[PDB]
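Reproducibility note. Readers wishing to regenerate the assembly model reported in the main text can use the exact inputs given here. Chain order matters: entities are listed in the order in which they were concatenated for prediction.
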Amino acid sequence: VQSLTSDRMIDFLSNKEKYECVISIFHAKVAQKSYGNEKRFFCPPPCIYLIGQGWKLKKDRVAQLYKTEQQATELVAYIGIGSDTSERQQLDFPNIYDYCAAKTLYISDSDKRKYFDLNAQFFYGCGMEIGGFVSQRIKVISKPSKKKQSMKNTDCKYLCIASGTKVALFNRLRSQTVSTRYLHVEGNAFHASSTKWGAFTIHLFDDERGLQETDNFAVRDGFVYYGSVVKLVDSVTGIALPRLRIRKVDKQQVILDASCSEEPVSQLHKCAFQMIDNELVYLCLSHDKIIQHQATAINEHRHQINDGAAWTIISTDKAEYRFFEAMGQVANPISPCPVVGSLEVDGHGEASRVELHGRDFKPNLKVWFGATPVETTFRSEESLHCSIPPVSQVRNEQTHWMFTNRTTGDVEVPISLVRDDGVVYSSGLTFSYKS
DNA sequence: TTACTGTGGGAAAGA
DNA sequence: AATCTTTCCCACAGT
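Running the prediction on these inputs yields the following structure tokens for the assembly.
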């Protein structure tokens, strides 16, 4: 009972946007630890967006299967470090069905944890439990690195900033928490919110040397160094900033020392963004308004910038989970959402198989090819394998359209993992029969 | 006004 | 050694 039905799968694939429940968590890849009683909060604040109409259908299927205090069809969310429930802080609250940010999380030196992740649990007012979802991995740091050179081993994965990764940028007035503001596009224009922040892909531009100049030979490691032309695009909506140059700051002074360029930018470093031309102007903040700014020289290797033009930069990550209760509205939470990493196809002939590598797989999942459910063998929460269904049976007239590449004319079916009580999880992957 | 509190900078210690 | 990380200490400007 409740096992997903081919027709019901088709209703869903053809209405993915409308039906699909999407939950996304954003946070920084690193977090400074708190010593003693102090509390050094995670900035930007981890937040969650419940995207898609799918959530409203769910609200109803709730409100109605409810009337069987008043309005207990509301969301109650909780977030915490790892699995412990001591510091389970309660979460506040276009096609954004709901949002929320944890603004006062912190991690104590008493926690021997060296890496960690955040766990957000959701429920309806009536106490109905939707599920728990984890953030991506977070490394703990003692303080922003004062490295002046670049190291080899140092897991740059967490301390350096790679050329196409995303970052948050925030301003803060004279060490005052309630003054923090995060760069954020609102109304296709840049601003500085106090509760929201955007992730910006940071594009690195190689240096136009060449020719006559034959001094160095390279520095091309992909990372972002000081004195670098960088373009910041808002990962959410194409909007971008004028290819600015990143300079390291130190107490209202933008150091230009002819050596700074050997220093890779790092997690939580303070910095400023000067114009390519007028290397005397900097991206500045003013009453939650992004304006350019004039800076006095105060030296040839220095500058005098106001607090409004100094930003703390930090690398950012995202975790997305997608689900749909295709058949009824299950009694169990969705909680362990399987995540598919890659789909491997080994062994050919008639015994051709597909290996699915991911996380949180469970024995109650069958892999589907479009609307064709195959035989699924569970290896481990990180491994599943099945057989490819015969092209011929992977689609009919009712579905010819959707599973055929209008161009190449080939069969391409979306891969989903369906849980025995009818919950569908888009893999995000596509199996083309080109085989 | 007094008590308490994130934050950024510095000292001292550890590596 | 010389430099960076970790831990402590603390004053600034705010609730």
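We highlight two features of this model. Residues 34, 37-41, 106, 143, 172, 174-178, 251, 270 of chain A lie near DNA strand B (CB under 10 Å from a C1'). Chain A is about 10% helix and 40% strand.
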